Amino acid sequence: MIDVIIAGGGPTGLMLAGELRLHGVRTVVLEKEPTPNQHSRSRGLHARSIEVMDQRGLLERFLAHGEQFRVGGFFAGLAAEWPADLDTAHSYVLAIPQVVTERLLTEHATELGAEIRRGCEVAGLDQDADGVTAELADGTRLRARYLVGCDGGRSTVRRLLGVDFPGEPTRVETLLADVRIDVPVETLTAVVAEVRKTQLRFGAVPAGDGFFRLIVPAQGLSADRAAPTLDELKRCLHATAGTDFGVHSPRWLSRFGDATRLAERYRTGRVLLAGDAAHIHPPTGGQGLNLGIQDAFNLGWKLAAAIGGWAPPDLLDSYHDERHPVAAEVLDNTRAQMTLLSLDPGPRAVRRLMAELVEFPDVNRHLIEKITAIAVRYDLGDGHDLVGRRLRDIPLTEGRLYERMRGGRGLLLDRTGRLSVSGWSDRVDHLADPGAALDVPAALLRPDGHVAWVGEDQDDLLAHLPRWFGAAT
Amino acid sequence: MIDVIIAGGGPTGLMLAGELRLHGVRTVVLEKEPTPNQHSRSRGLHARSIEVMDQRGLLERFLAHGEQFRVGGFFAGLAAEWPADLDTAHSYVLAIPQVVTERLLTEHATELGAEIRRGCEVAGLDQDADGVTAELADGTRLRARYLVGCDGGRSTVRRLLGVDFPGEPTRVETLLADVRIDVPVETLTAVVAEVRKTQLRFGAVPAGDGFFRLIVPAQGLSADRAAPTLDELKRCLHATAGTDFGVHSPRWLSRFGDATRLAERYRTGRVLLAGDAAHIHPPTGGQGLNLGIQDAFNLGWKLAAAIGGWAPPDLLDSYHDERHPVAAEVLDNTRAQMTLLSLDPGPRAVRRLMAELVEFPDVNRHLIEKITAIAVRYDLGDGHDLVGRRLRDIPLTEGRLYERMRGGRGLLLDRTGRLSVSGWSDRVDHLADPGAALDVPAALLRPDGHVAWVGEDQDDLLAHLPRWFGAAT
Ligand SMILES: Cc1cc2nc3c(=O)[nH]c(=O)nc-3n(C[C@H](O)[C@H](O)[C@H](O)COP(=O)(O)OP(=O)(O)OC[C@H]3O[C@@H](n4cnc5c(N)ncnc54)[C@H](O)[C@@H]3O)c2cc1C
Ligand SMILES: Cc1cc2nc3c(=O)[nH]c(=O)nc-3n(C[C@H](O)[C@H](O)[C@H](O)COP(=O)(O)OP(=O)(O)OC[C@H]3O[C@@H](n4cnc5c(N)ncnc54)[C@H](O)[C@@H]3O)c2cc1C
């Protein structure tokens, strides 16, 4: 029997499949497209996603297919330096195309035994007290204990669940185009720099093969929401840059809005939502793909705990309680960024003020920590500021903390030489290392790296173990 | 013969008259209203204006008619603490009604020998190579060497000069009302706090005599721009608070827009502009009256230098070069503040972000230093960061720096015990005090307190003296 069906083989579903396969969960990914999408939206990973890959041993292969960058401008394009005091051991951006990211995640989920089934489109679902049935577009049916809708921003699973998707509608539309041009690159760059003095939703990135990635504001809103024709691209280029640069031969044309919507419930019985299926927003700051990977990273071990039969009764609901607010804040900061990109005189004045403010180090650090998600703090109810946050990588006596996390289990980092997780040993590893560069006596880490407890008393630790690791065995 | 005619007896003109009378300038103020306006717009003075009064010995009488406050919320109503590290010796707000401020400034200009003429409205002007003629509404004429339009935001002088007044038109209108209500004050306060959770352009301040100062957003824009009727006040109260509180018996009704305009030239021959005559903007931050007082403080000694015949040929034009950019930045930060008061979802998201940012001390200090004008730096062409800024009050061996400035002349603060201003002694005082709490060897201060030179070489000081104090005598 299949334990979990994943609808959608994007980065969220692929990352989710990897996290489930770490614990033996029989996992089938139903991906509707017959062949992988060759068009990249995302252009890299932010610090928290980079850490997550390192916690799972995948950073080396990601670094081998990407380039590290330490540049500014990630909050509404506000030029700045990279914050020199970012509280991460992975303080950089990893430039890597989403097609490459999906490739690496596909290969890792496969080698762990996840079953990827392409050309399989979920069309219906029927759940009861024991499992979920997925109905494919060809009439075939698949049965599992749980189904997770990782099927993108226009999620079939979300619609079939009737989950409300409230937020702000699209009011600003932008065009996307991979095209060839009739001007030299230096001519394109000169015009772009002139337009970007006021209109920052205009840009051009070469693809290296003679094609150019163009971003250009749309004119009004479209009724069809369909892909723009080449003619529409030329009209918007003329309106924004005064010329269409002789664009021709598009190999990709697209239109995206700035709508911000959030699923009201991440869980409906035995069906859950993750990634763009649970939340949509503009790509300001490059947060969507990171937000989806970290949804799967939060959900994986919890869902595996359910399949394993040791999950506490509130564990699975903690996926919603923790990730729904994180997405709500992402949506809010993209609405703020979009306003800072507005041409209206009011927002322009606020933008100039933000330019003054980001010159202060604690502002620049605060904005980047927001964009890169390294400052996310779940409300776990404890007074300690570290509890609820992810623990950064730290040097041990030999090696580093993240090298001990590749199994996806719990981890008690103990410097007292006195604590014990006896009774939860199959679920929580005991890292007794007084030489660990951490200024707490001990820290209990969930399998997602988030701190669940800090202290030095054994009896205090024993009372905090059952919430995230169930009953002692 | 009259040296200077001042059109308008508001705080700008009254402050200007005081600065001119310090140097014997025969000064006539032509104020159109027969009796002083008893309605206050401003509710106090910010730090730079407070310092300016202390430099002229007027702070004691201002403090005796006002109350000192150290509270937050001066930038777009963003709640915060008063910055604990504000770089002023006068780190507070002086709560004092504008009617009281105008009263104190009227009495001080009079006791210095300025001639205030009420019921005198400037209707025309005619200038030539030798002077200016003011034509009053009753056909009488007055002749002087210079005329300064300090006649408010709808300046007659500005219009007659044909000076362009570019900027942003009014797009947001707000109502003002001194009225009585039919509800207890605690009922008014409860409703106000509920509305101010989203609409921050709504407020109520008691007047102490049973009347209440109401601020309420208007509905759209008015064609007449005339004063709102009581009916219009009730409609806007219902729309914004759901009730009109039983408002009745208005003793003041007003409407103001958010237009931001700036005179293209502060000087036209022998006619200059100052205060609201040179710039209009919303009252966000309470900056207008301070901006006007500091216009007069910049212009006074320069205009007196012209009348005295020792002004360098570029001195009078430096009034525009220094004050026009200062006003432009005030206008810009009020457009930013208005956006932060917008109800639209975009600006609301940016406001929440600003609320996060102002918790950082250097942000809170930066915004308040902007509002209170203590960080204004004129571009005097020198590399030293202090040059162009006003020097804060500092302790001397005995007393403080500002006590030596009441004559409105130049001041060389010398700690080397070696420098000399011989040749400019009638215009620049020599404060030789090695015990002065200032970490420069010496600083040359203009009569407005702004630093013109810093160093220790006598020959370097002699080359900088003529620019602001003319030829040696
Ligand atoms: C222009 C642009 C630029 C962006 N730039 C960045 C960036 O720089 N950084 C960043 O982090 N993010 C960025 N994003 C966002 C990022 O691309 C998305 O958030 C990311 O793809 C989300 O992954 P996902 O797996 O949730 O969903 P998706 O990638 O949408 O994939 C879901 C999968 O479900 C499949 N599917 C759909 N329906 C069904 C069905 N019924 N049955 C089975 N399978 C189905 C789809 O074929 C697809 O493969 C950008 C987005 C855009 C539009
Ligand atoms: C609601 C509101 C709240 C405000 N709150 C604050 C605040 O908290 N802090 C702050 O600093 N500022 C505030 N301001 C702004 C401040 O009130 C003005 O900037 C200030 O009055 C400017 O002074 P002024 O002397 O230039 O001009 P004004 O005060 O306008 O006075 C000019 C004078 O010229 C006279 N006059 C006009 N035409 C003629 C003519 N033809 N001949 C002769 N005389 C003439 C007028 O009668 C008047 O007395 C506020 C403004 C408003 C509307």
UniProtKB/Swiss-Prot annotation, chains A, B:
Database matches in Gene3D superfamilies: 3.30.70.2450, 3.40.30.120, FAD/NAD(P)-binding domain
Obligatory cofactor(s): FAD
Free-text note regarding domains: Contains three domains: a FAD-binding domain, a middle domain, and a C-terminal domain. The middle domain forms a cap over the FAD-binding domain and is involved in binding rifampicin.
Subunit structure: Homodimer.
Paired cysteines (S-S): none
Disrupted-gene phenotype: No visible effect on rifampicin resistance.
Keyword Heme listed: no
Descriptive protein name: Rifampicin monooxygenase
Residues that, per the record, bind FAD: 12, 31-32, 41, 98, 122, 156, 276, 289-290
Family of the protein in this entry: Belongs to the rifampicin monooxygenase family.
Function: Monooxygenase that can modify rifampicin, thereby inactivating its antibiotic activity. It constitutes a secondary rifampicin resistance factor.
Single Gene Ontology MF annotation: oxidoreductase activity, acting on paired donors, with incorporation or reduction of molecular oxygen, NAD(P)H as one donor, and incorporation of one atom of oxygen
Recorded catalytic activity of this chain's protein: rifampicin + NADPH + O2 = rifampicin para-naphthoquinone carboxamide + NADP(+) + H2O + H(+); rifampicin + NADH + O2 = rifampicin para-naphthoquinone carboxamide + NAD(+) + H2O + H(+)
Entry EC no(s): 1.14.13.211
Sorted UniProt keywords: FAD, Flavoprotein, Monooxygenase, Nucleotide-binding, Oxidoreductase
The encoding gene: rox
Binding locations of rifampicin: 43, 196, 285
Residue stretches spanning the membrane: none
